[PDB]
Amino acid sequence: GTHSHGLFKKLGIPGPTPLPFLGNILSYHKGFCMFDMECHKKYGKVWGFYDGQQPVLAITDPDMIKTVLVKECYSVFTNRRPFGPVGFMKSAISIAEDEEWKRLRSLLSPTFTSGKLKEMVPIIAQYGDVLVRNLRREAETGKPVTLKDVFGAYSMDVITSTSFGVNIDSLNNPQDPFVENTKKLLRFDFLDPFFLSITVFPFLIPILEVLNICVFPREVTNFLRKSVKRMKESRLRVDFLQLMIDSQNSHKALSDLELVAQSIIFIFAGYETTSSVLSFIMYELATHPDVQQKLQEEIDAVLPNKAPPTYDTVLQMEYLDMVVNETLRLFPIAMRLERVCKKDVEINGMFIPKGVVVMIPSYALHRDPKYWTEPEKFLPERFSKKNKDNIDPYIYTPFGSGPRNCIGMRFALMNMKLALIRVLQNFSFKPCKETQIPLKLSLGGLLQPEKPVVLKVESR
Amino acid sequence: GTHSHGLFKKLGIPGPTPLPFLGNILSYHKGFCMFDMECHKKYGKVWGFYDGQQPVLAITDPDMIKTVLVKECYSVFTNRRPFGPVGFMKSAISIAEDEEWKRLRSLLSPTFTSGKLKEMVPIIAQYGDVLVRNLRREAETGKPVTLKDVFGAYSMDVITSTSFGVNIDSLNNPQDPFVENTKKLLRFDFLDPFFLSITVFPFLIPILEVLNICVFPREVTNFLRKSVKRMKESRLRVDFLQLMIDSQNSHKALSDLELVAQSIIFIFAGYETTSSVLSFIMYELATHPDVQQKLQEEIDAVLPNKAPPTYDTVLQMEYLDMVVNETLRLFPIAMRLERVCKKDVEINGMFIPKGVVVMIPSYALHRDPKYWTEPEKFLPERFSKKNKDNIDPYIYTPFGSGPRNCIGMRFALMNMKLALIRVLQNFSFKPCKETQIPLKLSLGGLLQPEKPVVLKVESR
Amino acid sequence: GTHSHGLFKKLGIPGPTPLPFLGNILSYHKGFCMFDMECHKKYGKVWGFYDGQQPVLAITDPDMIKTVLVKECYSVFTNRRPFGPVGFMKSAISIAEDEEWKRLRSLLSPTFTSGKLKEMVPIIAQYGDVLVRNLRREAETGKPVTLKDVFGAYSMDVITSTSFGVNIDSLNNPQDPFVENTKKLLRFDFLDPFFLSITVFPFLIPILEVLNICVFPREVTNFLRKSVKRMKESRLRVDFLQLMIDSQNSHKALSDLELVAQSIIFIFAGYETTSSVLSFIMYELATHPDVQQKLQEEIDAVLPNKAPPTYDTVLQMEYLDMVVNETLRLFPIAMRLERVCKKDVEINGMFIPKGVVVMIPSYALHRDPKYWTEPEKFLPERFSKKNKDNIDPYIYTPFGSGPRNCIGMRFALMNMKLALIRVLQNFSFKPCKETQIPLKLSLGGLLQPEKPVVLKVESR
Amino acid sequence: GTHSHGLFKKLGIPGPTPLPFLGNILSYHKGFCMFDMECHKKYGKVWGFYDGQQPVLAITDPDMIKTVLVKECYSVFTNRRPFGPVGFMKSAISIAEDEEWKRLRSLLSPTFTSGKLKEMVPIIAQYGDVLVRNLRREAETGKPVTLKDVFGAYSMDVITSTSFGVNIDSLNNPQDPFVENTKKLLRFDFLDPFFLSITVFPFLIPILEVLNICVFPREVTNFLRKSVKRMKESRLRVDFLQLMIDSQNSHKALSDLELVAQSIIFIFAGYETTSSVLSFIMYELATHPDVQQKLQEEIDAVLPNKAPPTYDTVLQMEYLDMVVNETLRLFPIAMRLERVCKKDVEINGMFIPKGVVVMIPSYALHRDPKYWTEPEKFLPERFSKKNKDNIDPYIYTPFGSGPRNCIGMRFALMNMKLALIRVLQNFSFKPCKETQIPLKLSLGGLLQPEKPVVLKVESR
Ligand code: HEM
Ligand code: HEM
Ligand code: HEM
Ligand code: HEM
Ligand SMILES: COCC(=O)O[C@]1(CCN(C)CCCc2nc3ccccc3[nH]2)CCc2cc(F)ccc2[C@@H]1C(C)C
Asked: Any chain B CB within 8 A of the CB of D142?
């Protein structure tokens, strides 16, 4: 009931005090993000709490953070915490651990190079054209646009074609076989009934693992499993599947089911994340028409006459970059980074017992007054070539840092940027009566707007 | 490991001998139906086995059967066995038990009278017209027809409109909100991984009931729960919802959530059952064109010039009735009837300990040589007014018998008959090269064809 | 997590508000007794709380209490709550439920008549002689006496010989086979780690029931099971075993294992209960030498010259009775009486939903100022023939009331009285320096002294 | 249900075929030992089976065995399989794993040197004198002697005094506090109900670990935990406790609770093991009076006139050694050695997947005709300095081999030898009518006689 509940009181580490069995989870009634702020303010720089019986040690010192993410990554802090029954998805690089992770990490790093990415741009860019045509039809008829559905559909189209060559217009084909399953691959709400129970009955995982109950649905994983065995057997492009089929012709060649595992996790990592950030950005651009106009101006300069964006001209645009980064400062959608302490260690004047989840509260550091002037404000300027220098890369970590960081970072920024470019080239975006202002974050376990973002969309 | 595994060896009752923990479930590798036959042949008239640790006493004596289903129903054998975590669906009349069942049974019996049914015929009959139009378009283009999809869609249309007034053409609207959830309400395969585990880990039910994992999906039950709260609040027809909303204006008036519970179970009881029998019947009529022609002839006689069937002219047709009943003899899709023994009893020279599932092997009795001449053969004649007399109603029980029998019997026969009438009026049905002949039953826990039934469909 | 946690807020019933999963069990940090008082004071006459998810409705109205214990006992409130995995001890009359309880209750009522008891007095009385000899040897050498060990040994001797004819001097034979197991049969601490977990993981019971883990130890129950099969087979006295072997030569004759079940529960009900009350009484008599002297005087009057007590002269003694009853007022060692509500009901202007544990806080009513003048004080007089009249038998219930009350009441009072008589005849009892004064009740789940009672024991 | 059940059929490895859920455990109805022989004969040199879902790869090639036990011990095969909920005893060197094991292994190796052992001989030897006095009193009165009780008591006396300095005559004090708990520390029967369930519900371990249910009893571990905190605090000899208290004044000094953990495991490893081998040896010496006489002769030669054995004269005796070793050949009481495969590997032309329990069937190799002439026969000669050479130390492994072997080997042989010496010096031992001849091994999970060994004991 109190297993390890004296561990932090003992070691000298402060923090809220736990309740038996539940630990501190009642504190999650306002969300991971709000609880992390309060803990930063009211306890300082290091603190501890209990996800049920599991102690979690929050750390906020950039040198200490670097040690965990960078320095001792491979020796002490290699893995994230178990979070549910995962079945065969224990082979997805995100879930695999220790050496199996390192092998998967290596077998996949060449798939995410800039070269591989530059050759996917003409595919990603095609569904930007699709986006504008579907945006225009809703811009034609004066009717508010709900960003999450139009950007949701764009993200889906980008994934089907980048990882499977499946060329869909997911919006206009809302009944395709390939759209129904991939749309069931949403991000996990670790504050919803099931995942909370898993936290205070971690011993229920093995019970579930033996009933073959799985947090990745049996049908989705089954449909994609067989749908990929078709694609492999009809090919025998430039998409993730093929680069992976390539890398299996100094570690053990990528297995068959391991390739299926990665394709599904790429979807999981890329679907809701992308559409959610594109919507946050559109909210900020719609509530600061000066930033929007400025970006539209920077776009028309590089791309004269709605010229089509390319890998190289995308990377030209400084102010676009500043909008993307400043939006991810406010809304880092992972909320936290975490690693399991797998040994006893001392790092930066602090002993850490084997088994503690060490956690880095990204949302709260990105909104720390002590590192950010006027943190609540959308201020794209803080990332200009002028100011970009005094930003610590261990305070601002929307993609994490170190060897276990987001292997999809460059792909995701290039995907979102292509979207925002082709959309601002043709449209302007305005607040509504119904446009929730100021926007409220959800109280749940996902960093998303309370109410969806809806906006007026006009044509240029 | 062997809890109660001597109970039948002791009492004197024969039967296969169990394995620890698993009981006799390895015997289910050929299906409930085949295992029940072998047990009838090789052990006689009474026998016992173990679904894991749970003893099941099979009985085949018509007097003994009557005692269980009819005589001592309310005192000893009131309930079916628990079969999964059910959540709020513990209020569906099928799952409720003891007095709560009797109340629900009474609060719903007037909803299934013949009067209420005769006023639903013009609704049911409308989607017969819809069936023929969709059948014709597939009969127009010479392309094999897969019965389960065209009869699947008809069954869905009949349910939406009979229980919610929702008027859909489910086939041509394969993307309606109301079709996606109700199509996820299929019959349970108690021989599939999950339900088998539930059988040898019955103690896993409470674990699941507390994670709110449920065998009726949370979304389906949630969508229908709210979708009904709309219909109640827009009404404030002749459909099940309204007759139920009626019966809540000597027992406790039907509750709100109890009404939601029944509407979903009516779907569960009526969707796959109906479409599966309609397909079995079409198989038999397509593999005996003499029966088919004879029925077409009996239909044209009562209904001159594709005249539209009515409640009364439907009940006119003897040979139609004989085809429906003879098909349900071969294919009684419940396979077994069961009741939990809730007390110790002696019935017909046999003591039965509290807790035994008493079970009646319908599939095997319907195909018993000792009651049926040439049981394997489709012989509609055995049910004519001439021969219908020497059929024991405790050997032939496709809808069960007694107070807990199928409260939807008359509705289901009238629904299927309306379908078969309007379809034979306009079409003839022929075997294919691909038409699996002879048809094989599935090895799983549902009584359905191994491979789907597909047939040539011509026009008259 | 909150299953039924709105049930009392809804029905209108007040009470502390629950925490998810745990309900109100954090409130048990001071004990059932103290929590029950606070709830009586601060919420009044009726209230509700949650043992995890299980709602418990406390009631304190004598008419309402009578309804539950007496009036609707057989129809609505027949059983106590499940409390642990019990294995075969589900046949002990205390644990059995509904009709199986009524049968066991009837098959055992004639074993507890006054006639049967009067013939056990010469056995019980013999080990009073044994008590005095062992008390004297500790009274001889001036050394404090720890009541729980000398009365513990007396209680054990009374049980072995009353239920099995086994004639031991448990103290001087602290290594007999028959003493080691029966001494492991102590009362359950429902506030200790295991039983608390059972309360907030009631779903863990079936898991345990299938590993054959049992709250009655496998060895104790096994030793006594075989040790009784010896006694049955060597007999083939006046003791419980024989009266039971008798009653199996209008319900089903007592089974073999059912007889073993009762013998163990008689031990469980009678061992720690008796020794604990004898010690409470000795504390009160030692902290009021006037009561003690008065009782010694009433004993010498009826029993001139340490004359040996008999059934009839035991029942002569009014003041003895008043001391026993007043001690059980302060220390009713069951603390609460409970029944499961098995139907919906209205009783005395109150609706009660099926499934609620209805609970009667005996400890708090016995110490209610509103029924007892100076409740904290040991006042034997309130039970004299003069005052015994205005005591409601539904406020003062140390043995419960109604058909499910203590079937061992008369036996227990006669056993304790014989002890107290033969001991006061020969000894006087005095407070020590170490004698905890005032005595503190344990904070756990058993009503016993914090620290053991130790006292000076002199000879007469 | 069949998780990994194709792993051996796939890899090419033969073996009995499994049943769902249970694997091959029905095969354990004759015991680990008999099942291991049949598997050696009927499948050859390598085979696989399933303890439920857990694959176990048996290996019998001395080079392959050496690789696992010696060569790749620290890299691949460091740990034994989890076997039950162990609580804090996860710190006992036997249960600890990976580096924590290596640290414990090092912190304890100097406690088992020959120097430390030679200084414990005068303690061990003292309770040999105690043994002879208690043996004589049973040899005085002509009454069969049950070896397991007289050698059981000797083993207990040797442990209390070697690990805690507690100087008991456990037999004549069968009621000491320190004897009652340590006698509850018997070897685990992994074929008894509980441990078998753990094998096919390994997921039940975490459920138990959270109810603090433990396979080392809470009371035994609690009594010894506090009883050691006394001994530490009264000291602040030459016994295990002190050598351990010593080693905590290049790894982390032995913790407090870690020291308590080791003391209990030393008891667990040493109590039943020793007494069981001493009894096997006495059986063999009593059923071959020529060996016995020969040993008595070799003892009288080194120790003239019942001279007292010393470390050095104990190691003098070749024929004693040959009797001890030949008895452990027949009866290697661990039965199997095992290690978990923690990586994928190829060793001696064989790939082994991560997670397989690799197992070495000691009992069956010790009785392999292909390495042992007349294996069923007790032939002390095979271990003489003449023949001891062609015995492979990877076929004959009564204490295992390699870094994880029995850290108590020398202590155990010296303890048993001192016993056998002082006993044969004074007694001769003869078969009885009741002496089970030939002796049968138990069908359970412990290598012990079916029926106890009883023998005539005469004096010299
Ligand atoms: C705006 C979009 C995205 C954001 C903000 C984001 C952020 C993150 C973060 C914070 C992590 C954990 C980093 C850490 O623990 O240090 C992560 C991991 C990961 N992400 Fe992204 N991500 C995005 C999109 C994508 C995309 C398109 C992919 C496509 C392949 C992807 C694949 C992954 C993978 C595989 C990991 C786990 C890597 C490993 O365990 O070695 N993510 N992401
Ligand atoms: C061909 C179609 C159908 C067949 C063959 C069939 C057969 C059965 C059988 C064998 C039982 C159990 C009988 C027993 O235990 O004695 C049953 C129960 C039931 N059926 Fe039907 N059924 C069909 C369609 C329907 C329909 C359309 C409804 C619509 C309301 C329905 C509602 C129910 C209910 C509520 C029960 C449980 C009744 C109770 O527990 O009191 N069924 N059915
Ligand atoms: C001072 C000693 C004792 C006290 C204070 C005591 C008190 C109680 C109480 C409060 C109950 C529950 C009553 C209820 O729910 O209304 C009970 C039940 C019971 N007691 Fe006693 N008890 C004592 C000794 C004994 C003895 C010696 C026996 C010997 C047979 C015994 C046998 C039982 C049984 C069998 C029940 C359950 C009866 C049933 O469920 O029908 N008890 N006791
Ligand atoms: C006749 C008596 C004994 C026999 C036959 C015996 C045999 C064994 C065997 C086969 C093993 C496992 C070896 C392996 O996996 O390679 C073992 C382990 C062990 N034994 Fe002994 N043993 C005996 C007595 C003792 C005694 C007196 C001690 C006292 C300390 C002891 C302490 C241990 C320990 C601590 C281990 C685990 C070592 C580790 O995991 O590193 N044993 N024993
Ligand atoms: C839900 O919180 C945001 C989130 O989903 O973060 C990840 C999921 C990480 N998962 C492998 C489980 C690890 C345990 C965990 N419990 C958390 C609760 C709150 C906050 C963070 C938590 N971490 C992080 C890495 C990752 C790796 C992939 F391969 C695919 C998707 C993702 C997402 C991220 C891209 C948005």
From this structure: no
C420, two tokens: 């107290």
Task: List b or e across C353-382, with b for residues whose CB sees 16 or more CB atoms inside 10 angstroms.
Answer: beebbbbbbbbbbbbbeebbeebeebbbeb
Q: Which domain holds residue A165?
A: 1-460
Nearest to B207 by CA among A418, A207, D70: A207
Q: How far is B212 from chain A (nearest CA, A)?
A: 8
Q: How far is CA C15 from the centre of its chain?
A: 28
- The bridge status of strand D345-346 relative to strand C454-459 is unpaired
Residue C246's identity, in one-letter code, is D
- Put simply, whether B44 touches D (Cβ < 8 Å) is no
CA distance C383 to C393: 12
> First vs last Cα of chain D: how many Å apart?
63
The DSSP call for residue C309 is: P
Cross-chain CB nearest to A206 (options D203, D210, D343): D203
The torsion angle over the Cα atoms of residues D429, D434, D440 and D446, rounded to 10 degrees, is -80
Burial of B7 (0-12, 13-18, 19+ CB in 10 A): middle
Longest dimension (CA), chain A: 67
What are residue A54's phi and psi, to 5 degrees? -90, 115
CA distance C324 to C329: 9
* Token output for B64: 């003994």
CATH of the domain at B134: 1.10.630.10
The CA radius of gyration of chain A, in Å to the nearest whole number, is 22
Rounded to an integer, what distance in angstroms lies between the CA atom of residue A405 and that of residue A424?
30
The answer to whether B140 and B132 are in contact (CB under 8 A) is no
Rounded to whole angstroms, the Cα distance separating B128 from D238 reads 96
Helix, strand, coil percentages in chain B from 3-state DSSP, rounded to 5: 50, 10, 40
Please give the interface size between C and D, counted as residue pairs whose CB atoms are below 8 Å apart.
Answer: 25
Q: In what order do the strands lie in the sheet with C145-146?
A: C145-146, C454-459, C427-430
Tally Cβ neighbours within 10 Å of residue C456: 18
Phi-psi region of A145 (alpha: psi -120 to 50; beta: other; left: phi over 0): beta
Per 3-state DSSP, chain A is made up of helix, strand and coil in percentages (nearest 5) of: 50, 10, 40
The residues pairing with C150 across neighbouring beta strands, listed in sequence order, are none
Helices (H), B185-304: 193-200, 204-210, 218-235, 240-246, 256-286, 289-302
Q: What is the resolution of this structure in A?
A: 2.2
Contacts by residues B123-127 (CB-CB < 8 Å, ≥ 24 positions apart): B123/B161, B123/B162, B123/B237, B123/B238, B123/B239, B124/B158, B124/B161, B124/B162, B124/B414, B124/B415, B124/B418, B125/B308, B125/B309, B125/B310, B125/B418, B125/B422, B126/B161, B127/B154, B127/B157, B127/B158, B127/B161
Query: Nearest Cα to D405, choosing from D154, D25, D77?
Result: D77
What residues have CB less than 8 Å from A362, skipping those under 6 apart? Answer: A332, A334, A335, A336, A337, A397, A398
Domain count, chain B: 1
Q: Are C160 and C170 in contact (CB under 8 A)?
A: yes
| Ligand 4 environment, Cβ below 6 A | D 93-94, 105, 265-266, 269-270, 273-274, 277, 333-334, 337, 398-401, 404-408, 411-412
Q: Which runs of consecutive H residues, i.e. helices, occur in D119-255? A: 121-140, 147-163, 177-182, 193-200, 204-210, 218-235, 240-246
> What's at B24, amino acid-wise?
N
Experimental method: X-ray
Ligand 2 atom nearest to B96, measured from its CA: 40
| % helix, strand, coil for chain C, step of 5 | 50, 10, 40
From C346, C22, B78, B317, select the one nearest A2 (Cα to Cα): C22
Give CA–CA dist C261/C94, Å, rounded. Answer: 10
Residue whose C-alpha is closest to residue B69's, from B395, B334, B410: B395
- Is residue B40 within 8 Å of residue B370, measured between CB atoms? no
